């Protein structure tokens, strides 16, 4: 567990630490450069003094909650000023500018079909 978010045990540090929101693989590899952990020890074989070094580095980055709050106010701002990106956010449509004519499912969601 790091700062409230428990990572999967019996996993390598470089792999397990990505389970925290806001931290990916490239960021995780950065911890093991600062904190002297061999990136291969299981979280269950980890030593408490190694945990302190890891935890000190983690909060330095935008780890949890804050990144969730940051990403929301960014979209909320786009909603308030009614830009092209932000209006499409309201309607659940691809905001980048992809083709919504036939292929947009991870934004439209379920296929609510209309009969012919």
């Amino acid at each position: 567990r790091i700062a409230g978010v428990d990572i999967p045990r019996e996993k390598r540090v470089v792999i397990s630490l990505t389970y925290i929101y806001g931290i990916g693989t490239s960021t995780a590899q950065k911890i093991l450069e600062e904190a002297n952990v061999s990136a291969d020890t299981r979280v269950k074989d980890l030593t408490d003094d190694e945990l302190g070094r890891i935890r000190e580095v983690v909060d330095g980055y935008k780890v949890e909650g804050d990144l969730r709050r940051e990403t929301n106010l960014n979209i909320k701002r786009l909603m308030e000023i009614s830009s092209y990106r932000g209006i499409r956010h309201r309607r659940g449509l691809p905001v980048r500018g992809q083709k919504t004519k036939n292929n947009a499912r991870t934004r439209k969601g379920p296929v609510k079909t209309v009969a012919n």
Binding site: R77, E80, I81, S82, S83, Y84, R85, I87, V114
Partner: protein, 82 residues
């Protein structure tokens, strides 16, 4: 989009009719055709009648809108469902 060397883009005539009136107190409803100009920090408290293609929709410029072009704030297409 642009670069850091090139910097921000505002149409060569657009800011001229912005620092034209800023020495006065009242903002105006300047008719606009350049949708590609970045909303500059000096664009504050100013209605920009940006051409969507058929009309000049007005837009009061707040601080948050600085950074995006005024074209993002002018809806071109219209859709009311299916």
């Amino acid at each position: 989009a642009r670069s850091i060397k090139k910097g921000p883009f505002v149409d060569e005539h657009l800011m001229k009719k912005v620092e034209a009136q800023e020495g006065s107190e009242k903002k105006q409803v300047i008719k606009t055709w350049s949708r590609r100009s970045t909303i500059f920090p000096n664009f504050i408290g100013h209605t920009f009648a940006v051409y969507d293609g058929r009309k000049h929709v007005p837009v009061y410029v707040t601080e948050d809108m600085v950074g995006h072009k005024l074209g993002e704030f002018a809806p071109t297409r219209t859709f009311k469902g299916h």
